[PDB]
Design a protein around this ligand. Structure first.
Ligand code: CLA
Ligand code: CLA
Ligand code: CLA
Ligand code: CLA
Ligand code: CLA
Ligand code: CLA
Ligand SMILES: CC(=O)O[C@H]1CC(C)(C)C(=C=C/C(C)=C/C=C/C(C)=C/C=C/C=C(C)/C=C/C=C(\C)C(=O)C[C@@]23O[C@]2(C)C[C@@H](O)CC3(C)C)[C@](C)(O)C1
Ligand SMILES: CC(=O)O[C@H]1CC(C)(C)C(=C=C/C(C)=C/C=C/C(C)=C/C=C/C=C(C)/C=C/C=C(\C)C(=O)C[C@@]23O[C@]2(C)C[C@@H](O)CC3(C)C)[C@](C)(O)C1
Ligand SMILES: CC(=O)O[C@H]1CC(C)(C)C(=C=C/C(C)=C/C=C/C(C)=C/C=C/C=C(C)/C=C/C=C(\C)C(=O)C[C@@]23O[C@]2(C)C[C@@H](O)CC3(C)C)[C@](C)(O)C1
Ligand code: KC2
Ligand SMILES: CC1=C(C#C/C(C)=C/C=C/C(C)=C/C=C/C=C(C)/C=C/C=C(C)/C=C/[C@@]23O[C@]2(C)C[C@@H](O)CC3(C)C)C(C)(C)C[C@H](O)C1
Lengths: 224, 100, 209, 188, 177
């Protein structure tokens, strides 16, 4: 709804609620009405926040250490960890991207979302409603959210407080990972940090150099 | 005179066939307008059916008549200009508006 | 049409035609003939790919057959290595004979059916072989294609429907598998995450090379 | 006035009649105009596609073409429009015969003629064999018809540009272009 | 008359020292506002381009007519030496596209701005993405006022740049080249 955003923004920050000067929250930028727009923006923000909390934690984790399983040291000990990701195997990156995309398909599937107990986020459902893994053919034990429970029938107030904390913590994490990527790319960008270094190539470029693929991997004539 | 004469023979033959069949027995002055429904110039050639409007029929008839008279005068001028110049029309026109 | 798609697969398919080939016309025959033809073509393609995928793996692992087929020659079950080149190794007569056999099989498939699938029959329903009213053959030819020995007649109606849905889905899987195998065979780099094959053959969609 | 179809969001909800060219005629002449416009649109769409498939890419049909004169599809490997005057001599006639049969059947076997209360542009079967104009809503069909009209007008302007590009000096202010005869070599 | 544009910095009144109203009808006021808005938008584009090209800016990566050999960097960081560096084909194509767009603008707005309508508004070429599709009518008036103010500042800016190029040491903050 239009009026739920001011009250939630007051809840997460009482000093500056309903900050938005961008004039997009009214735009039906799919021609699907105001409510679908608000759901899409909320889902996109929450998704960006979660991906960036994971990215910031991964950067802080593998920026100094690694995990020895089988030859997982030659990749990690090569420049910054972004260059380590760029130097990873092509099948590895393809498997990662396709597994994430399969999770996207499971999230966006209306039948899978309806079994968990709500609808699509553009159709009145709560933006961010990754459904349970109960639908396939051969049993999968681990879910994505609550894989080993670590949660119970908590209060709805506790759920709302956790959602608000997740939203603003994800915003601060997106700022942090953007600053870290900018400092890795352009030295002297973030003036409060001068320790993270080394190039990332193009950080917004998964496939580079090592991955051959069927054409169209022309990194030549790139931009800045 | 430059083009083959068989081309002219076939063109004149096709025109002869067209106007022999367009009025099967309606040649001469005393036989053409015997029916009091043949208005002059109406050979029935209106495939697109412009003449079923009946509001622009008069303006189209006047446009055809005035354009025909203008084309008569124009073609006479073009022919005699080529006769007095020995050159085509627009080359002669460029030589009129040359410089001095 | 929605019921078969939903019972086959609910999450990634509600109806899922980016190309609107269902509810088309197909030779000005109607929607029902279109639907029956499309379903029969799907079932036939899935069955052919299922048999051919089993044949491809049983030829790639090295399992040939005994006895000297075409005994005067040696274009037999020791000739080729890749299964496309194995099928290309049949000189002239083996391919023509199996083509005539399949031609008869599909001719009777479309002949003996009591009601055609484009006219209101069940797609994928192979009709039974007839009595001794066809040519010089004395008995019923035992082979058929569905239930040669009366074993499959014990299944119930719900079991038959579940088997039909499993047949359709396994058909699609085998179709994808054979095209993946041939793409790996012809184009290296194409189809990663599969078994590694060698680059050979040319125009595998062309019989008489 | 026409007031039927083809006024998109470029002139804006209104008919484009500077000279008019309508209201000087009857109701059937407007339907003839629409039939001519749609045929021109489809022909120029196919002509743009053929010019693209001949001028640069050249994905020639595999095999020979004439069998008697030895004309090969690879031998037609120069010019957009001089390639037309190399397709044997009976090869042109067997294309013009197909086109003539299609149009005599389009004008005869369509029971209401378009100049008598019918619709300009219909189908015996040759349009949509695969059912690509299937169960889609009539608003979607109207949108696709408008897209066809605008794409065809753009295609007519496109073929008009690619014909008279290397023959009228600059004209089109672009740098590339192909050199051939403007019009084709008088049918057969 | 009343119109838009009037706000602060003038006391809420129409700024018009030397006549130039009371000889203008509704059509003339409509033409005045349409010319003002077109000048404002052209001048905003002009300052945004001049500042980005001359000061800094990464410039467009590419070649700009591979056949002739002119490169994007070789136009320069001036404009009157870079507009002249643009080839005649590019000049012709720019002018023809703008002329086609404005003929469509004149013939496509269903009430013309001097025959009714709203001056300075063309449904063509404006917002394709719906950024101003359903703003409130009071917010749209404020943004129209902001467009007018930023536009007038932009026209002053463009003529400052042109005056500094033609007449050196005019516009004193702006350098001599
Ligand atoms: C569409 C399916 C198909 C096709 C075209 C062929 C085609 C062929 N098979 Mg084959 N085969 C198939 C299915 C198929 N098979 C299946 C499902 C089996 C398992 C029962 C076999 C088992 C089989 C054996 C055991 C042998 C062949 C052989 C041959 C070749 C004679 C020829 C290339 C023979 C051959 O030439 O092998 C090299 C041979 O020895 N096939
Ligand atoms: C020969 C092709 C052709 C034909 C038959 C039509 C026919 C029609 N158009 Mg149309 N159109 C065409 C080409 C054509 N168009 C092209 C190329 C464009 C893009 C510029 C348009 C853009 C267009 C718009 C935007 C609209 C129409 C509309 C109409 C309809 C009403 C107009 C009318 O009654 O007069 C049509 C009568 C004729 C065309 C007589 C022929 C006169 C000849 C062509 C003059 C020659 C001009 C000259 C050589 C062209 C120079 C080159 C050019 C590239 C500039 C009518 C069915 C209107 C409509 O649909 O109303 C509902 C409408 O709003 N057309
Ligand atoms: C010379 C005879 C002739 C002519 C004039 C046409 C004309 C047409 N056919 Mg066609 N067709 C013909 C013979 C012919 N057919 C024959 C003999 C077959 C084989 C049986 C087909 C099979 C066929 C199919 C399968 C389809 C058409 C389609 C079309 C239409 C679009 C053509 C197009 O956009 O191409 C421009 C070029 C391209 C689109 C190539 C891009 C790749 C058009 C009405 C299509 C249609 O109606 O669209 C819905 C379509 O799907 N035709
Ligand atoms: C040529 C561009 C142009 C045009 C057509 C308009 C038009 C208009 N302005 Mg406007 N304005 C402009 C530029 C322009 N403005 C600029 C650049 C500024 C910033 C200084 C302003 C600041 C301004 C204010 C503060 C107000 C207006 C108002 C108005 C409206 C009524 C005034 C009137 O009748 O004069 C219209 C006719 C003309 C302007 C013709 C131009 C006359 C000569 C040719 C101008 C010569 C100037 C000179 C050469 C410039 C030298 C350089 C310069 C940078 C100093 C009208 C719609 C008033 C309004 O909104 O009323 C509702 C109002 O209060 N304008
Ligand atoms: C009055 C307008 C105007 C004019 C005449 C010019 C003229 C020129 N510019 Mg320029 N420019 C402009 C505005 C203008 N610019 C603006 C507003 C910007 C900011 C983005 C730039 C940024 C810019 C760069 C970065 C470069 C030029 C360059 C050039 C020169 C080469 C031609 C060229 O490629 O232009 C290209 C001009 C444009 C792309 C601006 C078009 C202005 C229209 C109104 C906008 C249309 C785009 C529209 C928003 C659609 C985009 C969608 C997008 C929002 C997703 C030429 C002297 C090049 C050069 O070598 O200069 C010496 C060069 O590298 N310009
Ligand atoms: C982006 C579109 C575009 C642009 C910028 C031009 C630009 C030009 N064309 Mg042009 N033209 C175009 C598209 C375009 N054309 C198309 C699509 C066709 C149809 C095939 C033509 C057909 C055409 C012809 C037939 C002629 C031109 C000519 C010209 C030149 C002079 C025009 C003139 O006097 O301005 C007039 C400006 C207004 C009326 C405003 C000019 C360089 C002429 C030429 O050759 O000069 C070099 C000429 O005779 N044009
Ligand atoms: C009971 C219940 O409900 O469940 C509980 C149980 C349980 C399992 C624990 C939960 C969980 C799951 C998890 C794993 C939640 C994880 C949350 C996670 C992982 C949150 C990361 C954030 C990263 C941030 C905020 C950014 C740091 C950013 C920083 C520090 C900066 O940018 C600072 C900096 O920029 C300056 C200022 C200047 C720059 O020059 C220098 C740098 C760049 C350094 C729940 C759901 O949470 C709660
Ligand atoms: C990208 C990448 O990773 O590359 C590749 C890797 C890899 C592994 C190569 C791939 C593959 C290949 C695939 C998926 C191949 C699939 C092949 C498939 C699915 C092949 C079906 C055979 C079925 C038969 C023979 C059934 C016979 C029929 C039988 C046994 C019956 O009579 C059925 C019966 O019902 C009756 C009629 C009556 C009942 O009363 C009794 C029973 C029930 C017995 C992938 C996954 O595609 C991707
Ligand atoms: C001077 C300057 O700067 O600019 C220059 C640049 C440049 C480029 C040189 C110029 C040019 C040439 C131009 C612009 C040429 C344009 C040509 C054009 C516009 C050509 C359309 C073809 C459409 C086809 C073939 C459609 C087939 C459509 C088919 C086969 C369908 O059945 C449609 C289908 O929908 C159904 C019915 C059902 C759907 O389920 C499926 C699909 C969607 C498939 C100009 C004019 O000179 C201007
Ligand atoms: C418009 C579409 C079209 C249709 C629907 C169509 C139908 C048939 C049918 C009916 C089923 C037959 C049986 C048939 C047969 C032949 N065609 Mg086709 N044909 C079409 C197009 C062309 C073109 C463009 C050419 C061509 C030719 C030949 C030759 C010449 C071989 C020879 O001379 O040895 C032979 C035998 C070439 C040609 O005649 O060159 C002198 C040539 O260039 N055809 N053609
Ligand atoms: C940027 C760029 C280029 C460009 C450009 C372009 C297109 C530039 C365009 C510039 C343009 C279009 C500039 C208009 C100015 C109009 C003004 C200032 C009007 C003032 C009018 C005024 C100040 C009127 C004031 C008053 O009337 C008021 C309001 C009331 C009256 O009672 C009293 C008076 C009369 C005093 C190049 C050169 C092509 C190449 C380069 O590379 C890139």
């Amino acid at each position: 709804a239009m009026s739920a955003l001011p009250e939630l923004s007051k809840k997460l920050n009482p000093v500056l609620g309903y900050w938005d000067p961008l004039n997009l929250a009214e735009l039906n930028f799919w021609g699907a009405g105001d409510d679908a727009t608000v759901g899409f923006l909320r889902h996109a923000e929450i998704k960006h926040g979660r991906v960036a909390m994971a990215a910031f934690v991964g950067y802080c984790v593998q920026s100094n250490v690694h995990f020895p399983w089988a030859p997982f040291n030659s990749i990690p000990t090569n420049i910054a960890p972004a260059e380590q990701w760029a130097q990873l195997p092509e099948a590895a990156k393809w498997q990662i991207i396709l597994f994430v995309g399969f999770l996207e398909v499971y999230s966006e599937h209306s039948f899978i979302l309806e079994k968990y107990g709500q609808k699509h986020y553009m159709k009145g459902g709560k933006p961010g409603f990754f459904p349970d893994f109960d639908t396939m053919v051969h049993p999968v034990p681990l879910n994505l959210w609550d894989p080993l429970k670590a949660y119970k029938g908590a209060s709805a107030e506790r759920k709302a407080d956790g959602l608000l904390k997740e939203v603003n913590n994800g915003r601060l994490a997106m700022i942090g990972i953007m600053g870290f990527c900018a400092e890795a790319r352009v030295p002297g960008a973030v003036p409060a940090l001068s320790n993270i270094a080394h190039y990332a190539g193009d950080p917004m470029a998964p496939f580079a150099a090592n991955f051959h693929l069927p054409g169209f991997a022309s990194x030549x004539x790139x931009x800045x | 005179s430059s083009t083959p004469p068989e081309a002219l023979a076939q063109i004149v033959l096709v025109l002869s066939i067209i106007e022999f069949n367009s009025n099967k027995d309606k040649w001469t002055m005393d036989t053409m307008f015997t029916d009091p429904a043949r208005e002059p110039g109406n050979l029935g050639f209106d495939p697109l059916k412009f003449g079923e409007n009946k509001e622009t029929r008069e303006r189209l008839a006047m446009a055809e008549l005035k354009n025909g008279r203008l084309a008569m005068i124009a073609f006479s001028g073009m022919i005699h200009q080529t006769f007095v110049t020995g050159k085509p029309l627009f080359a002669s026109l460029n030589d009129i508006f040359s410089s001095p | 049409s929605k019921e078969e798609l939903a019972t086959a697969l609910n999450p990634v398919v509600g109806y899922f035609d980016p190309l609107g080939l269902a509810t088309a016309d197909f030779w000005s025959q109607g929607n029902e003939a279109t639907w029956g033809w499309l379903r029969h073509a799907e079932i036939k393609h899935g069955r052919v790919a299922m048999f051919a995928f089993v044949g491809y793996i049983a030829q790639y692992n090295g399992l040939h057959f005994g006895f000297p087929l075409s005994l005067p020659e040696s274009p037999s079950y020791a000739a080729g290595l890749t299964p496309p080149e194995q099928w290309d190794a049949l000189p002239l007569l083996a391919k023509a004979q199996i083509f005539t056999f399949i031609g008869f099989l599909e001719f009777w498939s479309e002949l003996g059916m009591e009601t055609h699938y484009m006219k209101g029959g069940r797609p994928g329903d192979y009709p039974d072989f007839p009595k001794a009213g066809v040519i010089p053959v004395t008995p019923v030819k035992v082979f058929n294609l569905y239930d040669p020995f009366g074993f499959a007649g014990k299944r119930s109606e719900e079991q038959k429907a579940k088997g039909l849905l499993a047949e359709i889905n396994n058909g699609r899987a085998a179709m994808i598998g054979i095209m993946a195998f041939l793409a790996e065979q012809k184009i290296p780099g194409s189809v990663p995450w599969g078994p590694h094959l060698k680059p050979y053959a040319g125009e595998v969609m062309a019989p008489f090379m | 006035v026409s007031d039927m179809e083809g006024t998109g969001p470029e002139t804006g909800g209104k008919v484009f009649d500077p000279m008019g060219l309508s209201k000087i005629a009857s109701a059937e002449t407007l339907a003839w105009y629409r039939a001519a416009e749609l045929k021109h649109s489809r022909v120029a769409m196919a002509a743009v596609t053929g010019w693209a498939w001949v001028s640069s890419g050249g994905p020639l049909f595999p095999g020979y073409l004439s069998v008697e004169q030895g004309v090969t599809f690879e031998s037609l490997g120069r010019d957009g429009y001089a390639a037309w005057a190399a397709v044997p001599e009976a090869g042109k006639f067997q294309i013009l015969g197909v086109i003539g049969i299609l149009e005599i059947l389009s004008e005869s076997a369509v029971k209401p003629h378009y100049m008598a209360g019918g619709t300009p542009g219909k189908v015996p079967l040759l349009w949509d064999p695969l059912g690509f104009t299937a169960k889609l809503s009539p608003e979607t069909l109207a949108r696709k018809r408008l897209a066809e009209l605008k794409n065809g007008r753009l295609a007519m302007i496109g073929v008009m540009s690619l014909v008279s590009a290397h023959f009228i000096p600059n004209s089109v202010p672009l740098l590339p272009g192909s050199v051939x005869x403007x019009x084709x070599x008088x049918x057969x």
